[PDB]
Amino acid sequence: VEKRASMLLFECAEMRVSDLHIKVYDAEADIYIRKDGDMELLRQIESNTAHSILASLYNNADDSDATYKINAYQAARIVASKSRLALPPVIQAVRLQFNPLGQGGRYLIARFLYTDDPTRFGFHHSHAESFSRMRNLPIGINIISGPTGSGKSTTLKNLLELLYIEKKKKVNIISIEDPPEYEITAQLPTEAQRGEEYRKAITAALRSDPDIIMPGEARDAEVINLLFTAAMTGHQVWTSLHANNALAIFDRLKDQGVDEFKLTDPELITGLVAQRLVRKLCAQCSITLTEYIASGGGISDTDRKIISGHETSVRFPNPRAKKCCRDGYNGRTILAEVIEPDSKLLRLVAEGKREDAQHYWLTSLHGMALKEHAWLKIISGEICVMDAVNKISGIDNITEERKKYLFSRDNEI
Amino acid sequence: VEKRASMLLFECAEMRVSDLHIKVYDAEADIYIRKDGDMELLRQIESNTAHSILASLYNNADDSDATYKINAYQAARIVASKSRLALPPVIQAVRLQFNPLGQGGRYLIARFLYTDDPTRFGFHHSHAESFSRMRNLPIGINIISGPTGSGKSTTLKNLLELLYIEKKKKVNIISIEDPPEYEITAQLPTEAQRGEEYRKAITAALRSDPDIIMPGEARDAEVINLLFTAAMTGHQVWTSLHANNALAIFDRLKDQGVDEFKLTDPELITGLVAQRLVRKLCAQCSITLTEYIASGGGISDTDRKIISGHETSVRFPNPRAKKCCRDGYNGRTILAEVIEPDSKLLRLVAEGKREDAQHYWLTSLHGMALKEHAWLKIISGEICVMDAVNKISGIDNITEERKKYLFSRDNEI
Numbered sequence: 001v002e003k004r005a006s007m008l009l010f011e012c013a014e015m016r017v018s019d020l021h022i023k024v025y026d027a028e029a030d031i032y033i034r035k036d037g038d039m040e041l042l043r044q045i046e047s048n049t050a051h052s053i054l055a056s057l058y059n060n061a062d063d064s065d066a067t068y069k070i071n072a073y074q075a076a077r078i079v080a081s082k083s084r085l086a087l088p089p090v091i092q093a094v095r096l097q098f099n100p101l102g103q104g105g106r107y108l109i110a111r112f113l114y115t116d117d118p119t120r121f122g123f124h125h126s127h128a129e130s131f132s133r134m135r136n137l138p139i140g141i142n143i144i145s146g147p148t149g150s151g152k153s154t155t156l157k158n159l160l161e162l163l164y165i166e167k168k169k170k171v172n173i174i175s176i177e178d179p180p181e182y183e184i185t186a187q188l189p190t191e192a193q194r195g196e197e198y199r200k201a202i203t204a205a206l207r208s209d210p211d212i213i214m215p216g217e218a219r220d221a222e223v224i225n226l227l228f229t230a231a232m233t234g235h236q237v238w239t240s241l242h243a244n245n246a247l248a249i250f251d252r253l254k255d256q257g258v259d260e261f262k263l264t265d266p267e268l269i270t271g272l273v274a275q276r277l278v279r280k281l282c283a284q285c286s287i288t289l290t291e292y293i294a295s296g297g298g299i300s301d302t303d304r305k306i307i308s309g310h311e312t313s314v315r316f317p318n319p320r321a322k323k324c325c326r327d328g329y330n331g332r333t334i335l336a337e338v339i340e341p342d343s344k345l346l347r348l349v350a351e352g353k354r355e356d357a358q359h360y361w362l363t364s365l366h367g368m369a370l371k372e373h374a375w376l377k378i379i380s381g382e383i384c385v386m387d388a389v390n391k392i393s394g395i396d397n398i399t400e401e402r403k404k405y406l407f408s409r410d411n412e413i
Numbered sequence: 414v415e416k417r418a419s420m421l422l423f424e425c426a427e428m429r430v431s432d433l434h435i436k437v438y439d440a441e442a443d444i445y446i447r448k449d450g451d452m453e454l455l456r457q458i459e460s461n462t463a464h465s466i467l468a469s470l471y472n473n474a475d476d477s478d479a480t481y482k483i484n485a486y487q488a489a490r491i492v493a494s495k496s497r498l499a500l501p502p503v504i505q506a507v508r509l510q511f512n513p514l515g516q517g518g519r520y521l522i523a524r525f526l527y528t529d530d531p532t533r534f535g536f537h538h539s540h541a542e543s544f545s546r547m548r549n550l551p552i553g554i555n556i557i558s559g560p561t562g563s564g565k566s567t568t569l570k571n572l573l574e575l576l577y578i579e580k581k582k583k584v585n586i587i588s589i590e591d592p593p594e595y596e597i598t599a600q601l602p603t604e605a606q607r608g609e610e611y612r613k614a615i616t617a618a619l620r621s622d623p624d625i626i627m628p629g630e631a632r633d634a635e636v637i638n639l640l641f642t643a644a645m646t647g648h649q650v651w652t653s654l655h656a657n658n659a660l661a662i663f664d665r666l667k668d669q670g671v672d673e674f675k676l677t678d679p680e681l682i683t684g685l686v687a688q689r690l691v692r693k694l695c696a697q698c699s700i701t702l703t704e705y706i707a708s709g710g711g712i713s714d715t716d717r718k719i720i721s722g723h724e725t726s727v728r729f730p731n732p733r734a735k736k737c738c739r740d741g742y743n744g745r746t747i748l749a750e751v752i753e754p755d756s757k758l759l760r761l762v763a764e765g766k767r768e769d770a771q772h773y774w775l776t777s778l779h780g781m782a783l784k785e786h787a788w789l790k791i792i793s794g795e796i797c798v799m800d801a802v803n804k805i806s807g808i809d810n811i812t813e814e815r816k817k818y819l820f821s822r823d824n825e826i
């Protein structure tokens with residue numbers, strides 16, 4: 001019945017979830033919700049009710065092909081102002097994909113787009129100092145890189161407010177984003193139609209004086225090729241894409257076809273930022289290493305190298321679900337690294353060395369790696385080592401001399 | 414009502430503005446005018462009158478598609494001799510772009526093209542000496558580079574008069590420019606139709622004996638490819654494009670597809686000029702550092718390195734809006750750099766080094782960087798440091814030894 005689906009959607013929206021998974025195995029249907037950063041088994045409904053609510057949810061979507069096509073793959077969107085299922089106000093539009101599984105089974109995936117202090121949410125103080133120098137440059141291009149759940153839009157919206165405040169209304173702030181994101185400056189709104197509308201918006205934005213162009217989700221090769229022209233025309237661009245390690249971004253640019261000469265300019269590129277999101281331990285509900293191993297403590301051999309020398313400073317999630325917080329995790333913090341481009345650093349990458357350029361950036365430019373930033377928060381006890389290893393790789397490969405140098409700078413400040 | 418729009422346009426034209434912005438937020442509409450180089454909040458009109466005047470202005474344009482299309486993006490032009498809104502005589506034609514914003518909101522942008530002592534408006538004396546040698550060469554190609562509001566057309570018109578006077582009518586001066594610009598020698602006048610007309614004009618100009626061809630706004634790859642042939646045929650070309658730093662121009666040429674061998678000739682290229690426009694402080698209404706910090710003086714830490722050693726010579730804008738001038742700013746001066754091409758300098762760029770070619774130009778050729786020219790005027794107190802930092806980047810990165818050498822040459826002359 002459609003009312004059961006409406007109630008499930010309403011109770012799922014208010015739970016602050018990321019993604020919704022519904023799996024059908026022809027005997028029971030499992031519900032999964034990505035609470036914080038991981039999915040959890042919510043409930044197991046029966047098959048007939050699951051099929052009924054799936055059909056009701058698909059038929060109430062504004063995009064339909066007048067058939068369900070169980071054997072085929074389906075995709076649809078549900079938008080605001082056209083919904084008969086009493087859509088909650090905390091969501092504007094969602095996308096839902098139906099995938100067949102096994103014999104007469106379904107796999108519904110929903111992305112659940114939501115609506116929504118000055119700076120340094122989880123960034124290091126060096127990152128904040130670098131951002132201050134980055135915001136003062138009148139021209140250039142900056143890249144924000146990370147996975148799908150890396151919180152790029154939140155960082156862009158936070159930087160936009162700082163740019164708006166600091167410039168004292170001496171520049172024009174125009175931003176283009178088809179899905180609205182709470183309150184934000186000027187904001188501008190099939191797959192082919194959406195791509196054509198995005199192309200028209202990005203080719204009409206340059207007609208006006210852009211100053212700061214503020215695009216989003218540079219997905220097409222021609223779009224980013226046009227964007228790079230405006231980057232060197234004398235504008236400033238703040239865009240985000242999907243990448244990792246803060247150095248494979250140039251590989252993505254070369255895959256898109258931006259040529260070698262455009263990326264050799266140190267003046268054009270102004271900074272690279274790579275960020276990940278990891279669960280943050282509760283400060284009130286925390287236990288030490290001895291208290292953790294006293295009650296079913298299991299720690300791998302490779303992890304003991306990370307916590308070596310700082311056993312007391314580390315913290316672990318608190319079990320038994322006390323009155324404070326929910327499960328020992330409050331929010332989700334950011335582990336980020338920022339690279340300031342240089343002539344020699346860009347020349348090394350342009351030669352395709354992929355080795356000793358990272359060493360040059362880490363030593364000469366006094367940069368900090370993502371693994372180093374993760375280890376620094378591990379020492380401080382802000383996050384758990386178990387989630388840090390599962391989210392960030394190569395943490396155990398940091399040398400002791402590097403660890404001492406990282407700890408000395410944090411201790412002296 | 415159309416009369417309110419006509420009155421607003423008339424009072425905006427006489428105010429000597431650059432661009433016009435109208436933003437609609439469905440409750441009030443904000444008006445912004447780019448006085449000098451920055452926009453300022455003019456007024457907040459109500460929504461219904463704003464929509465009425467926008468509709469009246471769009472319907473009076475000579476280009477229309479018989480619909481407003483609020484949800485879509487629109488662009489139009491208003492030309493002379495066809496206008497029912499009593500167009501002021503100080504403008505020939507304007508272009509106006511309509512952009513949707515939010516829900517039922519508009520974003521009007523207007524470029525406001527205007528109509529309009531021998532030399533050295535704001536250039537250095539070395540720039541004037543280099544221009545004298547540049548004007549005596551019978552063949553070659555020169556490039557003027559800068560952002561949209563860099564005043565390239567004014568510099569080209571100023572150089573054209575010097576070329577006309579100095580040659581004593583021994584050469585033929587032909588210039589091609591579709592929008593007329595006050596009085597100027599011979600002047601020659603959808604987007605596809607305009608491009609085809611420009612192509613026809615540039616392919617018919619070479620039919621006559623060009624001597625000095627004087628083009629404008631080299632925007633197409635085929636147009637500049639044809640222009641480079643006439644450059645090496647034995648003519649002289651004075652064109653302008655959008656670039657920065659006086660060295661990324663070659664990157665723009667390679668993006669347009671001019672090949673490596675055409676740019677390796679030292680005889681072909683005759684000079685590169687990169688200019689920016691910055692607000693100039695009033696000489697009568699000026700205050701020192703102590704007087705500025707005595708009344709709400711806020712200076713960043715990085716700025717104190719620039720003003721180090723020359724605190725008394727620097728000047729700041731004078732508040733309280735005295736009887737003289739308007740707001741302490743009179744006009745807008747030019748910060749420019751000129752690079753004379755050389756065989757080794759062009760060979761270094763042709764190898765794609767992007768490093769030590771700037772050092773070779775700065776040391777061996779005795780050139781002056783844009784940041785160096787900005788710092789020289791900062792020391793003299795002609796312009797404010799706050800605008801110089803916001804318009805020119807990397808000023809604080811100049812070494813002390815370079816500063817001493819720059820100051821010695823200015824002091825000895």
Ligand SMILES: Nc1ncnc2c1ncn2[C@@H]1O[C@H](COP(=O)(O)OP(=O)(O)NP(=O)(O)O)[C@@H](O)[C@H]1O
Binds near residue numbers: 148151152
């Ligand atoms: N301090 C924080 N930093 C980053 N993200 C946070 C923070 N706090 C909460 N979030 C999450 O940021 C999310 C906002 O959406 P966001 O992750 O920025 O979109 P996105 O990264 O572009 N994902 P996608 O569009 O699929 O690539 C919210 O769901 C929050 O759970």
Ligand SMILES: Nc1ncnc2c1ncn2[C@@H]1O[C@H](COP(=O)(O)OP(=O)(O)NP(=O)(O)O)[C@@H](O)[C@H]1O
Binds near residue numbers: 566567568690744747
């Ligand atoms: N000494 C000066 N030097 C340069 N420009 C000046 C000077 N004085 C005034 N101006 C401005 O020069 C402008 C003339 O238009 P101009 O800036 O040359 O067109 P443009 O640079 O080609 N812009 P665009 O066509 O959009 O690329 C006037 O608006 C003046 O405000």
Ligand SMILES: [Zn+2]
Binds near residue numbers: 283285324
């Ligand atoms: Zn707690």
Ligand SMILES: [Zn+2]
Binds near residue numbers: 695697737738739741
């Ligand atoms: Zn004055």
